[model samples]
Target: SANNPWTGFQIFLSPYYANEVAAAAKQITDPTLSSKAASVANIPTFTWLDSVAKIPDLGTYLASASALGKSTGTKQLVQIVIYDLPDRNCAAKAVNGEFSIANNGQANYENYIDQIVAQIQQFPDVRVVAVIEPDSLANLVTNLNVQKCANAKTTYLASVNYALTNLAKVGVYMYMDAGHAGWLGWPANLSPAAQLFTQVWQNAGKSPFIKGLATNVANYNALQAASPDPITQGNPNYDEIHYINALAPLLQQAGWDATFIVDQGRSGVQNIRQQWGDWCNIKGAGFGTRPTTNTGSQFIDSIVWVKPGGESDGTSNSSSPRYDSTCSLPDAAQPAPEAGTWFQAYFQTLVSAANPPL
Candidate 1:
């Protein structure tokens, strides 16, 4: 009964721990663990490739299924990448839009949106939670110039608008990007709240296109610590809660209802002492907040892991050298693994090993 809360609900994001769970399940030959693995595997998960692949079909399937009475008991979710646009790069830029789209001709943004809408249509009962883009707007606001920031904002709004228009047939809850509280402080991180929200709203097009904005999507305690003050101690990690409270009014003035979500994926074992930059390895951080109805204020919406646990954040894997690149390799380079098989393994490992407080 303890696992009942997560039971029957499919987790729609790829997690590395899934593989570890399946591996453990195989080793012990435990049917219960095996079943858990199977349950996790069946959930609808997504990635950037899907944005250009069978996304439209997937949305249609989800919508049609939900339209029928069969929608219940099914876990359906969609991952929307806000960075996959023309000139955004998370790896090198550490900011958004710093990368050039030399190969931009390869994918069509409109088609990508269409596919996502189609997938949403397939399941009316499906609850669409748009991850928006990870670090795109946030990173840009932190490090880029005015023109670049404007471009990033335009690209972000375009994607959101496309999603809103096409996915109108289905229910979609959109979350915009907020770098993290640490990335929002004045001066080095200074991008006024009104300016940011105004840019976001201009592109997102009015209120209904978005549900709210998600903060601390990938970063951990550093962002939390940075939330209340400047990111650094000379800038000392400020009181995150207080900073969020201050920003609330600005978001409202911009005509956007703000709902914040934190990334609790790797936080189960967060190391508060380590340099604010060292969140990739720290563990044991638990779920920051439970999933509950919005309270309407500095905090609304449940804190969920936009980034799953166990998956390598482009760092060394269970058996690999530390490399600063995206963990594109198969789940630790396993044999004939299914799509995202490695992610499943990583997720299982983190979930089992960290066992953070829920």
Candidate 2:
């Protein structure tokens, strides 16, 4: 009888994004834009624990959330992105993790999970939802042909299962990453993706804490498309809604009833990318939907801002080891900083062009 963490509580506006908003506010010259940028601080954005170095930040943010809960009448909830698997992002180089599967990455990951669980345990009263391992299993579904992905398959499954089984011991709700509509929406990938999810859940002892799936993390895909974007030309699951609708039933048929949360952080404008695969900081992107339970489907828990709106997706530097060509594409914003660093211009664009217009 596990309950959804989002049901009764309001999402917490982590100080992390608030600080970014403040900095963005200081730089913008236009009063209207600065005011709009300041308004962004009020929106709830997910805190990403993307590396082991980020584990301690969970405690700091959770403490702030706890303090706010006591000060305000509202019950505060926090959404966290649990990324950083070994050999992570096998299909790309931009956000490579700090650990490698061969060099004690598994043991390091176990300790990483342990520390995170301890932090969440300290703030049991704060409703927490974790978006687990953003692109880990999704790569296994569609990119196993890549040697790195193929080699990391077994370890990836084991590590994700370990996370599920342990995190279940805590009060947090979990959402396994299912990628975006443009990536896994194809009919060929749907069944296999569901099967992999089923296998992992079974392996994790079917922990009730692992709620369902999180889609479109750090990607731009519409919640429901009015018309197909040229990038989504042949894929019937042309939007996040369609992708979830198609995938949920397959999971049910596999005897696993799944729910979902879609990321609309930077998806405000559609058909802007030159290629469906262009996932760096897109030039004309804007913030999408706000956090809400009005997801229009019982199977969807909420529409979230999983990727904090202003962070650079990757570096545009051609020579850096972390550089990925995707960030330098004509469609991507130029002169971008390294991944996870702030991109002031990008943030301003997201604010100025927000779908609902902050």
Candidate 3:
């Protein structure tokens, strides 16, 4: 039987997002947003691993981060995006990141796990939730036809299982990646992906057993919408809410006992086009629902801002090296800078356009 671990109304508020709030406040002037800005300033979010090569001594980082979370009276729910698999993010250049399965990658990943465990050991007082490896396994199922992807498939499972098994030992809440509504929302791809997801969980020994699954980790699809959206011809989803309802049972039937977590950071984006898959730092995008357990669904744990709204998803220029052309789409609010760089204009748009009225 599956159960929601977060029984009462509780969510984390890391000092990292708090800093963004102050920065957003000084940069904005629409008086209507004063309340919204203050609210966003205190919202709970998951910190992501933008780069594998640049991770600091995480145990040291953990001590400081956990101390800050204690001050805020919130759990420290940390999300590390395992994005550095071989040829990671092949299509998206700005965020195309480090490490390769071909070159001592397994050993390096094991060392990374050891570092994470040390960090968890430091924060016995603070509760930690780990969102493991965004898009890693899903990519294996979705794009295995690509030679680089096919080559990395075997190592990918070994490494993710290693992380899941070892992280379980640290006594932290772990959520395996099930991708988002738009990517795995369709029936054709959903069941097979769920089976693959379960195999990894079982192969990994299922101890930490994964607290649940995280969706829309970095994508901006709405959590729920009144209208129907067939994200692409391959994906027909009503939204994250509907997507979860359809897929949860598949995983559950396959022997996974976990709830679901959603990233609502950029989901409030309006004027959704028919094309789907335009996932740069999109224009007209806004923060979606704040983190909460009251999803009004039996299976969902919370709607979180896991991707952090303001960071650039990729570079805008089509010709730039490692650039993803989606950034240069005609609908772009402004040519945002490279991935992870701050873009005041886009952040302003997100804040102004937050849905459910900020």
Candidate 4:
């Protein structure tokens, strides 16, 4: 019998989930169950397609639905990616040009934060999970250039601070980006990224505003094999789970009291790469780590799917996309299928065999 594990806990549904459910219901033959499911079926899961839709309306919809018990009870969290620092992509410029902000590039990034805050205010009850940025801090360590490395630290700090201040209106849980565990092994690589967050608190001359840091935002396996572990025999440089283990102590030493979160959206089924050191292409990786409620010294916050299951990772270049499937793209070492479509397909396959909530 399939049960809603999060019956009481609020689950953030991206608009993408709405589409996925619709596609699934279309294949259902049982009218009664389908109609019942339809009531909760179309809640929107966030996605790139409608990322920048106006905040007030979205907030209102969420709030109204929540109040009516159609969408209430659970705190729905959304991830906000903040990449494109000044040096790398003129991030400030892009933000200012795309969105109307009052600061007008005078802390242009801050204006973006202001916009998010304004929207959050509208839906007071909506809980948000702010995934500050993916790979923003990791890239600094992965392919280091002294100049960019320095900028990465500063930019990372600024981004974290901005999110904390502007989005403080609602019950927002901010998760800083920590590269997966594989990336944090070496002292040289891990220290800078770790310090990046530490410095954000130090420089702010205030307590760290973020709830915690998130690892493996889009990666499959959160656990990575340490060096001398043998990649050929299925070991990667970093694992997010491993990253969390190493990061916890370092964060405490640095005078910060933050926890960690893992992106477990697609990890429920272990991918075959588990045997070959390639977790990207293979499917069926069991949920890497289960998120727990206890926020203790050794463990961090709940595990979440920052990267929803079905969306193209740009694999196959195929026009038809599916969730949890790899995308086709050149230069991608191990491409993943579209997360949304693949998950929808996976659900249909399950329902065809037996109705859910059985």
Best by lDDT: 2
User: Top model by TM-score, which number?
Assistant: 2
Off by over 4 Å in 1: 1-51, 54-83, 90-100, 105-107, 145-171, 185-193, 222-243, 278-298, 315-349, 352-358
Angstrom error at residue 117, model 3: 1.5
RMSD (Cα, Å) of model 1: 7.2
Stronger candidate by TM-score (3 vs 4): 3
lDDT of 2 by residue, 195-304 (tens): 89999988987777778899999998899877989988878888988888999998888667778999998988888988898999999999998878788986898898
Q: Where's the lowest-lDDT run of ten residues in candidate 3? A: 1-10
Taking the tens digit of each residue's C-alpha lDDT, what string does model 1 give over 3-38?
111234444533323444445446434465455444
State which candidate, 2 or 3, has the greater lDDT: 2
Instruction: Give the worst 10-residue stretch by lDDT in candidate 2.
Output: 1-10
lDDT of 3 by residue, 1-358 (tens): 3445555324445556678777777767877776577677677777765555435634544666576666877655454454445456633434365666667877777776776677677677655677887867777767777666677788778877887888787777778777777677767778877888888888877674487788888787777776655544445665777788888888778767668888888877645654566777766788888777778777788777778777777777667676777777865555777777777787877888888667
Error of 3 at 167 (Å): 0.7
What is the lDDT of every predicted structure here?
0.48, 0.87, 0.70, 0.48
- lDDT string for model 4 (11-56, tens) is 5555545656666566566786465434334332333211334444
Off by over 4 Å in 2: none
Local lDDT at 228 for model 4? 31
**Which candidate order results from sorting by TM-score in descending order?**
2, 3, 1, 4
